[PDB]
Write a protein that binds this ligand. Structure first.
Ligand SMILES: *C1=CC(=O)N(CC)C1=O
Ligand SMILES: *C1=CC(=O)N(CC)C1=O
Lengths: 79, 21, 255
């Protein structure tokens, strides 16, 4: 229930499913997704609800509901 | 000009998992 | 049969009052797990849909789906002859042609009960599968209200326009234009003041401001509003209530 949360990070091509405590900084999650991609952490941006997720923030204060999708795109000049 | 809500409803209708704690 | 008991007749009156700002008639679809109040505005452009969940009621019972087509005048008339603090009970059988409201003062053993003849209403035909949505934003409902009150002063129509990182509201009077541009944002200090945008398709619609002016009254009920627009589909505005959901479906205007 209140314990954890499950999240998907999709780069449009592939996915990864994640379990983390609602209070954990997303930094790790983001890094985990980056390495499993073989990309540089700073070469992609993680969008959520239209905002640009910041490594510092946690799912809790982002209003994250179970099985939310997080969008990773290449760091470029908008779509 | 405004349109009708129904004629618009008519026209309209017609495997890894990583874990961190 | 149908037996719906509100703890306070005023709760029901509040509902009836809300509706009386937009519509004359409501259809009360009573299903086994709550009631879905449905109405269409007189000019046939706005569609309101209220979902009174079961825990909203003091005691609910529906042995079989019935539709109670009511006239909001009549209903308000009956509600006068009742005290806001009385319990209210709607009583109907499996195929009604008439309903009974039953007011009950518990602290005195007073019981009052009036009949109401039902009628046929076309908002029985609200069979929207909710469809699907190019874009979906959500924002503080009063913030949305402020915007609407401002630009509705400029013009008879308002234009919403969504883009990968931009919601842009605009109105053009022959006395002045004006426009708001908002951007998805979050803060930890006040999470509930946040703007969430989920875009899949740039959208650009225009709505009659008077309708938007009705729609915004929902803000008293919910401190956030969800907006879902799609190219050629009615826009959805919706407010979460504790025991249900208020929803408007508004047709955009064509060019
Ligand atoms: C028109 C204003 C309002 O608040 N509602 C909800 C019942 C309307 O239908
Ligand atoms: C209370 C006022 C009134 O007109 N009626 C008849 C519907 C009442 O019950």
């Amino acid at each position: 229930p209140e314990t954890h949360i499950n999240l998907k990070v999709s780069d449009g091509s592939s996915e990864i499913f994640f379990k983390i405590k609602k209070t954990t900084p997303l930094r790790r999650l983001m890094e985990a997704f980056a390495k499993r991609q073989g990309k540089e952490m700073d070469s992609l941006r993680f969008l959520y609800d239209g905002i640009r997720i910041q490594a510092d923030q946690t799912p809790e204060d982002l209003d994250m509901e179970d099985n939310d999708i997080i969008e990773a795109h290449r760091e470029q000049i908008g779509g | 000009s405004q349109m009708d809500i129904f004629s618009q409803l008519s026209r309209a209708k017609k495997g890894e998992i990583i874990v961190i704690d | 049969m149908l037996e719906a008991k509100f703890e306070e007749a005023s709760l029901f009156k509040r509902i009836i009052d809300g509706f009386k700002d937009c519509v004359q008639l409501v259809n009360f679809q009573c299903k086994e797990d709550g009631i879905i109040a449905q109405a269409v505005d007189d000019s046939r452009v706005l569609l309101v849909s209220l979902e009174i969940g079961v825990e909203a009621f003091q005691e609910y019972r529906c042995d079989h789906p019935v539709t109670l087509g009511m006239d909001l005048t009549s209903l308000s008339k009956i509600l006068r002859c009742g005290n806001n603090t009385d319990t209210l009970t709607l009583i109907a059988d499996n195929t009604p042609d008439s309903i009974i409201l039953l007011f009950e003062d518990t602290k005195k053993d007073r019981i009052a009960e009036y009949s109401l003849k039902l009628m046929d209403i076309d908002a029985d035909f609200l069979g929207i599968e909710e469809l699907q949505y190019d874009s979906t934003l959500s924002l503080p409902s009063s913030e949305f209200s402020k915007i609407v009150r401002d630009l509705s002063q400029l013009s008879d129509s308002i234009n919403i326009m969504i883009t990968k990182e931009t919601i842009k509201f605009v109105a053009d009077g022959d006395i002045g234009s004006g426009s708001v541009i908002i951007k998805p944002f979050v803060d930890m200090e006040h999470p509930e003041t946040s703007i969430k945008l989920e875009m899949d398709q740039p959208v650009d619609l225009t709505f009659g401001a008077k309708y938007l002016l009705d729609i915004i009254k929902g803000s008293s009920l919910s401190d956030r509003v969800g907006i879902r627009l799609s190219s050629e589909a009615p826009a959805l505005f919706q407010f979460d209530l504790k025991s249900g959901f208020l929803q408007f479906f508004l047709a955009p205007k064509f060019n």
